[PDB]
Design an enzyme around this catalytic site. Structure first.
Site, PDB file in Angstrom:
ATOM      1  N   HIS A 314       0.835  -1.210   0.000  1.00 27.32           N
ATOM      2  CA  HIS A 314       0.000   0.000   0.000  1.00 27.32           C
ATOM      3  C   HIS A 314       0.861   1.248   0.000  1.00 27.32           C
ATOM      4  CE1 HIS A 314      -3.944   2.077   0.594  1.00 27.32           C
ATOM      5  NE2 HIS A 314      -3.103   3.012   1.004  1.00 27.32           N
ATOM      6  N   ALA A 315       0.709   2.143  -0.991  1.00 26.72           N
ATOM      7  CA  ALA A 315       1.655   3.213  -1.239  1.00 26.72           C
ATOM      8  C   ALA A 315       1.758   4.170  -0.065  1.00 26.72           C
ATOM      9  CB  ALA A 315       1.215   4.060  -2.402  1.00 26.72           C
ATOM     10  N   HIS A 344       0.422  12.179  -5.681  1.00 26.50           N
ATOM     11  CA  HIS A 344      -0.058  12.255  -4.303  1.00 26.50           C
ATOM     12  C   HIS A 344       1.059  12.021  -3.299  1.00 26.50           C
ATOM     13  CE1 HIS A 344      -2.927  11.719  -0.988  1.00 26.50           C
ATOM     14  NE2 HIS A 344      -2.071  10.786  -0.565  1.00 26.50           N
ATOM     15  N   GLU A 345       1.797  10.962  -3.481  1.00 28.53           N
ATOM     16  CA  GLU A 345       2.888  10.610  -2.605  1.00 28.53           C
ATOM     17  C   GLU A 345       4.005  11.624  -2.674  1.00 28.53           C
ATOM     18  OE1 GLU A 345       2.384   8.413  -0.369  1.00 28.53           O
ATOM     19  OE2 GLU A 345       0.619   7.417  -1.262  1.00 28.53           O
ATOM     20  N   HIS A 348       3.355  14.484  -0.379  1.00 27.36           N
ATOM     21  CA  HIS A 348       3.753  14.245   0.984  1.00 27.36           C
ATOM     22  C   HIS A 348       5.247  14.545   1.130  1.00 27.36           C
ATOM     23  CE1 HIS A 348       0.045  12.678   2.525  1.00 27.36           C
ATOM     24  NE2 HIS A 348      -0.001  11.530   1.846  1.00 27.36           N
ATOM     25  N   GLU A 372      -2.629  15.590   2.667  1.00 25.03           N
ATOM     26  CA  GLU A 372      -3.175  14.820   1.565  1.00 25.03           C
ATOM     27  C   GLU A 372      -3.400  15.612   0.269  1.00 25.03           C
ATOM     28  OE1 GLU A 372      -3.143  11.789   1.901  1.00 25.03           O
ATOM     29  OE2 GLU A 372      -2.707  11.810   4.149  1.00 25.03           O
ATOM     30  N   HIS A 471      -6.867   1.141   5.492  1.00 22.38           N
ATOM     31  CA  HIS A 471      -6.776   2.074   6.612  1.00 22.38           C
ATOM     32  C   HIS A 471      -7.401   1.610   7.922  1.00 22.38           C
ATOM     33  CE1 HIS A 471      -6.292   4.125   2.871  1.00 22.38           C
ATOM     34  NE2 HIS A 471      -5.706   5.140   3.451  1.00 22.38           N
ATOM     35  N   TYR A 481      -9.074  12.470   3.934  1.00 24.66           N
ATOM     36  CA  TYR A 481      -9.251  12.355   2.509  1.00 24.66           C
ATOM     37  C   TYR A 481     -10.477  13.117   2.028  1.00 24.66           C
ATOM     38  CZ  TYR A 481      -5.688   8.784   3.196  1.00 24.66           C
ATOM     39  OH  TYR A 481      -4.539   8.116   3.509  1.00 24.66           O
TER      40      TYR A 481
HETATM   41  C1  LIG Z   1      -2.525   5.408  -1.688  1.00 22.99           C
HETATM   42  C2  LIG Z   1      -2.768   6.228  -0.457  1.00 22.99           C
HETATM   43  N1  LIG Z   1      -1.931   5.691   0.635  1.00 22.99           N
HETATM   44  C3  LIG Z   1      -2.020   6.436   1.905  1.00 22.99           C
HETATM   45  C4  LIG Z   1      -1.088   5.797   2.924  1.00 22.99           C
HETATM   46  C5  LIG Z   1      -1.296   6.424   4.283  1.00 22.99           C
HETATM   47  C6  LIG Z   1      -0.502   5.838   5.442  1.00 22.99           C
HETATM   48  C7  LIG Z   1      -0.487   6.517   6.650  1.00 22.99           C
HETATM   49  C8  LIG Z   1       0.207   5.995   7.727  1.00 22.99           C
HETATM   50  C9  LIG Z   1       0.870   4.806   7.617  1.00 22.99           C
HETATM   51  C10 LIG Z   1       0.799   4.084   6.462  1.00 22.99           C
HETATM   52  C11 LIG Z   1       0.089   4.610   5.379  1.00 22.99           C
HETATM   53  C12 LIG Z   1      -1.585   7.883   1.670  1.00 22.99           C
HETATM   54  O1  LIG Z   1      -0.531   8.194   0.982  1.00 22.99           O
HETATM   55  O2  LIG Z   1      -2.324   8.864   2.127  1.00 22.99           O
HETATM   56  C13 LIG Z   1      -4.233   6.182  -0.140  1.00 22.99           C
HETATM   57  O3  LIG Z   1      -4.642   5.294   0.639  1.00 22.99           O
HETATM   58  N2  LIG Z   1      -5.036   7.101  -0.679  1.00 22.99           N
HETATM   59  C14 LIG Z   1      -6.475   6.938  -0.402  1.00 22.99           C
HETATM   60  C15 LIG Z   1      -7.033   5.560  -0.678  1.00 22.99           C
HETATM   61  O4  LIG Z   1      -6.609   4.983  -1.738  1.00 22.99           O
HETATM   62  O5  LIG Z   1      -7.879   5.092   0.097  1.00 22.99           O
HETATM   63  C16 LIG Z   1      -7.126   7.995  -1.290  1.00 22.99           C
HETATM   64  C17 LIG Z   1      -6.061   9.059  -1.494  1.00 22.99           C
HETATM   65  C18 LIG Z   1      -6.023   9.831  -2.846  1.00 22.99           C
HETATM   66  C19 LIG Z   1      -4.902   9.252  -3.619  1.00 22.99           C
HETATM   67  C20 LIG Z   1      -4.263   8.102  -2.887  1.00 22.99           C
HETATM   68  C21 LIG Z   1      -4.703   8.309  -1.423  1.00 22.99           C
HETATM   69 ZN   LIG Z   2      -1.670  10.563   1.423  1.00 24.22          ZN
END
Ligand SMILES: C[C@H](N[C@@H](CCc1ccccc1)C(=O)O)C(=O)N1[C@H](C(=O)O)C[C@@H]2CCC[C@@H]21
Ligand SMILES: [Zn+2]
Ligand SMILES: *[C@@H]1O[C@H](CO[C@@H]2O[C@@H](C)[C@@H](O)[C@@H](O)[C@@H]2O)[C@@H](O[C@@H]2O[C@H](CO)[C@@H](O[C@@H]3O[C@H](CO)[C@@H](O)[C@H](O[C@H]4O[C@H](CO)[C@@H](O)[C@H](O)[C@@H]4O)[C@@H]3O)[C@H](O)[C@H]2NC(C)=O)[C@H](O)[C@H]1NC(C)=O
Ligand SMILES: *[C@@H]1O[C@H](CO)[C@@H](O)[C@H](O)[C@H]1NC(C)=O
Ligand SMILES: [Cl-]
Ligand SMILES: [Cl-]
EC number: 3.4.15.1
Length: 575
Positions: A314-315, A344-345, A348, A372, A471, A481
Site C-alpha cells: 500500500h503506497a 499524491h505521494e 507528501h 493529503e 486504513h 481524505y
Molecule cells: C494510496 C494512499 N496511501 C495512503 C497511505 C497512508 C498511510 C499513513 C500511515 C501509515 C501508512 C500509510 C496515503 O498516501 O495517504 C491512499 O490510501 N489514498 C487513499 C485511498 O486509496 O484510500 C485515497 C487518497 C487519494 C490518492 C491516494 C490516497
Molecule cells: Zn496521502
C-alpha cells in the site's frame, strides 16, 4: 519558567530526531521486508520510542501551559503532553503494538485462491481484476474473496484494538480514540462543517450515481441493476467502489469523440515507475518547489520487489526526521491511476521537505487534509487533456470537454461519500455506539445511506468488510481524505488565479507557475505552527473550507448530467 520551557523543547527536539529516525528505519525495514527478524527489531524499536515518549511526555505535563507566554513553546509542550499509545501500561502497550502489527501484516499478505489454481494478491492481481473485468461473476469472485480472506481475518483483532486505542485516548484526556483523532483539526465545529460540505456535493453525486446506474443497467442487464435502487458494490472498477474511473469505457458521454486510453499509451511508450516519479518531480520543480534529494532515488521502493521479499504494498511516503532522508514505498503499476497516486505521494515528500527546519513537534500538515491535498493539486493539472498531450499520452470540443469532466468526476465526485463514511463508522465504533455484534451491518447501512451501494452477496456472521480496506487494520484516519478532496479544488482555483488562468477552471494547467509554487510553499513551511485557517488564507485569500471551487469546476458536468438524467426519466437516489 519561560527559560525552563525553552530548554525542554530544545532537548525534546534533539532527542526526538534521533529516536524517531531509528524507529522510522525499523518500520521501513519491516514494511519493505516482512520477516520474523525485521518484525522483532520493530517491536523493540517500539519500546525505545515509547520510553522516550513517556520520559518527555511526563516532563511536558509538569508544565502549566496556562502560565506560558511564548505561543510556539506553549504549543509544542501541549502537543508533547499527548503520549498516544505510550500512555498505556506496559502489558497493554505490548499487546497493542502486537495487534497493530498482526492486523497490518494480515492485510498485506492475504491472498485469494482458485481451487487448485493460482493465488492472487490485492496489488496488482485483484486490483487489475476489479479495474478490467466486465463479467459479473469474475468481479464477484474477487470482491467476495478479498473480503473473505482479508476482512474476516481482521475481525479477531478488532475489538481488542478498539479497547486499547480508546484506553490510550482516555489516558491522554480524550473521551475515545475518535475524539483524539478529530482533535487534530483543532476545530470544534468540525462535524457540523463537514456535514454541510457533504450536503453541498449531493446534487452532483446523486446525478452521477443515476447516470452510472443507467450505464451499468445497459451492460450488466436489467435483471442485475435496479434503476430505482442502490448499485452493486463490485461493478465500479475498484475494490471499494471508492473511485469509478476504471469504468469510464462503460459511461462515456460522447463515445464518438476521439479518445486514447492513457494507460495503454504509457505502456506503448515504455513508461516505467521511475519515469512516473521523475515526471512528478519535474512538475514540482517547475513550480519553483523543491526537488527530491539524490538519496530519495537511491533508497525509495518504487516497484514491487521480484526477489522473494514480501512487502506492504500500500503506497506511502516516509519522513526519517533527519531533514535529508525522504522515501516513497509503492508497488507502482504503469497506468494513469498510479501516476496520480505517485503525484499524491510526491506531495507528501514535498511537505516533509518544506517543514524540515521546524521543531519536530510542528512537522505536520496544517491539518491532515492539507498533507493529503498537495500532490492531488498538481495531479489535477497533470490529468488535463492538454497536459497529457504534452507528455505524448493523448494525440489531441464541447464533447471532449464533457468526456474529460466525466472522467474526473468518476474519481473525485464518487470518492466524496466514501471518504465521508469511513470515519463516520469508526467514530461510532470508538464512542461505543456500534458494538462488535453490529460492525458489519452498520458499515453497510452507511454504504447504502451515503454511497447508494449494496453488497452483491448477502453478508453473514463473521464478515468484517471494513477490515478489507487498508486504513482500518492499519489504523490510519480517513476523514483527511474527505477534507483533501474538498480543499484541493479550492487550492486549484486559487493557484489558477495566481497563475493568470482565465476561462473555465477545469481547463487550468498550473505547470511552470512560480506564482502558484510560492503560494504553496509559504503555506507548507508553516507546518503545524499556526491554526490551519492561516494556511488556508495564505493559499486562497480566505480562511474557510468551501465546496464552491469543486462545484465551480464541475458545473458544466452538473448541467449536462441534469439534462441527460431528465431526458431518460431517472429517479435520483434510492430507498
Ligand atoms: C494510496 C494512499 N496511501 C495512503 C497511505 C497512508 C498511510 C499513513 C500511515 C501509515 C501508512 C500509510 C496515503 O498516501 O495517504 C491512499 O490510501 N489514498 C487513499 C485511498 O486509496 O484510500 C485515497 C487518497 C487519494 C490518492 C491516494 C490516497
Ligand atoms: Zn496521502
Ligand atoms: C517564541 O519562541 C519561538 C521559538 O524560538 C526558537 O525555539 C526556542 C525553543 C528557542 O530555542 C529560541 O531561541 C528559538 O529561536 C520564536 O520563534 C523563532 O523566532 C526567530 C526570530 O527571533 C526565527 O528565526 C529565524 O531563523 C531563520 C532560520 O534560521 C533565519 O534565517 C531568520 O532570519 C532571516 O531574517 C533576517 C533578518 O535579520 C535576514 O538576515 C534574513 O532574511 C534571514 O534569513 C530568523 O532569524 C525562528 O525561525 C522562529 N522559530 C520558530 C521555530 O518559529 C518566537 O519569536 C518567540 N516569540 C516571541 C514573542 O518572542
Ligand atoms: C530481509 O530481512 C532479512 C531478515 O532480517 C535479511 O536477512 C535480508 O537481508 C533482508 N532482505 C533485504 C532485501 O533487505
Ligand atoms: Cl465493503
Ligand atoms: Cl484525519
Amino acid at each position: 519558567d519561560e527559560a525552563e520551557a525553552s530548554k525542554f523543547v530544545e532537548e525534546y527536539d534533539r532527542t526526538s530526531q534521533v529516536v524517531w529516525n531509528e524507529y522510522a528505519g525499523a518500520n521501513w525495514n519491516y514494511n519493505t521486508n516482512i520477516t520474523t527478524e525485521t518484525s522483532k527489531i520493530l517491536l523493540q524499536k517500539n519500546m525505545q520510542i515509547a520510553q522516550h515518549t513517556l520520559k518527555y511526555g511526563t516532563q511536558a505535563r509538569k508544565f502549566d501551559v496556562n502560565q506560558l507566554q511564548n505561543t510556539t513553546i506553549k504549543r509544542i509542550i501541549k502537543k508533547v503532553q499527548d503520549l498516544e499509545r505510550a500512555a498505556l501500561p506496559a502489558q497493554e502497550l505490548e499487546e497493542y503494538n502486537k495487534i497493530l502489527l498482526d492486523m497490518e501484516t494480515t492485510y498485506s499478505v492475504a491472498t485469494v485462491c482458485h481451487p487448485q489454481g493460482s493465488c492472487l494478491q490485492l496489488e496488482p492481481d485483484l486490483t487489475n481484476v476489479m479495474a478490467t473485468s466486465r463479467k459479473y461473476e469474475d468481479l464477484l469472485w474477487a470482491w467476495e474473496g478479498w473480503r473473505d480472506k482479508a476482512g474476516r481475518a481482521i475481525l479477531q483483532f478488532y475489538p481488542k484494538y478498539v479497547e486499547l486505542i480508546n484506553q490510550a485516548a482516555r489516558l491522554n484526556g480524550y473521551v475515545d480514540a475518535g475524539d483524539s483523532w478529530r482533535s487534530m483539526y483543532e476545530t470544534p465545529s468540525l462535524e457540523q462543517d463537514l456535514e454541510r460540505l457533504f450536503q453541498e456535493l449531493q446534487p452532483l453525486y446523486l446525478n452521477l450515481h443515476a447516470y452510472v446506474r443507467r450505464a451499468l443497467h445497459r451492460h450488466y442487464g436489467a435483471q442485475h441493476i435496479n434503476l430505482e435502487g442502490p448499485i452493486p458494490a463490485h461493478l465500479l472498477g475498484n475494490m471499494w467502489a471508492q473511485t469509478w474511473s476504471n469504468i469510464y469505457d462503460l459511461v462515456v458521454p460522447f463515445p464518438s469523440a476521439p479518445s486514447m486510453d492513457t494507460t495503454e499509451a504509457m505502456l506503448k511508450q515504455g513508461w516505467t515507475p521511475r519515469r512516473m516519479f521523475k515526471e512528478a518531480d519535474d512538475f514540482f520543480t517547475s513550480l519553483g518547489l523543491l526537488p527530491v534529494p539524490p538519496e530519495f532515488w537511491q533508497k525509495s521502493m518504487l516497484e514491487k520487489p521480484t526477489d522473494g521479499r514480501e512487502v506492504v504494498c500500500h503506497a506511502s511516503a516516509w519522513d526519517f526526521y533527519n531533514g535529508k532522508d525522504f522515501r516513497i514505498k509503492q508497488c507502482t503499476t504503469v497506468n494513469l491511476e498510479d501516476l496520480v497516486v505517485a503525484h499524491h505521494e510526491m506531495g507528501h515528500i514535498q511537505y516533509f521537505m518544506q517543514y524540515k527546519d521546524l521543531p519536530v513537534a510542528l512537522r505536520e500538515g496544517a491539518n491532515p487534509g492539507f498533507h493529503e491535498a498537495i500532490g492531488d493539486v498538481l495531479a489535477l493539472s497533470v490529468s488535463t487533456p492538454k497536459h497529457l498531450h504534452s507528455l505524448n499520452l493523448l494525440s489531441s470540443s464541447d464533447e471532449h470537454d464533457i468526456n474529460f469532466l466525466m472522467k474526473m468526476a468518476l474519481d473525485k465526485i464518487a470518492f466524496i461519500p466514501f471518504s465521508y463514511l469511513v470515519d463516520q463508522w469508526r467514530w461510532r465504533v470508538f464512542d461505543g455506539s456500534i458494538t462488535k455484534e453490529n460492525y458489519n451491518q452498520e458499515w453497510w447501512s452507511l454504504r447504502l445511506k451515503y454511497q447508494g451501494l449494496c453488497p452483491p452477496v448477502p453478508r453473514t456472521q463473521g464478515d468484517f468488510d471494513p477490515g478489507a480496506k487498508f486504513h482500518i487494520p492499519s489504523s490510519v484516519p480517513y476523514i483527511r481524505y474527505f477534507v483533501s478532496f474538498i480543499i484541493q479544488f479550492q487550492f486549484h482555483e486559487a493557484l489558477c488565479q495566481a497563475a493568470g488562468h482565465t476561462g473555465p477552471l477545469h481547463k487550468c494547467d498550473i505547470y511552470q507557475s512560480k506564482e502558484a509554487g510560492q503560494r504553496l510553499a509559504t503555506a507548507m513551511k508553516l507546518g503545524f505552527s499556526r491554526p490551519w485557517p492561516e494556511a488556508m488564507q495564505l493559499i486562497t485569500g480566505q480562511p474557510q473550507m468551501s465546496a464552491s471551487a469543486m462545484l465551480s469546476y464541475f458545473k458544466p458536468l452538473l448541467d449536462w448530467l441534469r439534462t441527460e438524467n431528465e431526458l431518460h426519466g431517472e429517479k435520483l437516489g434510492w430507498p
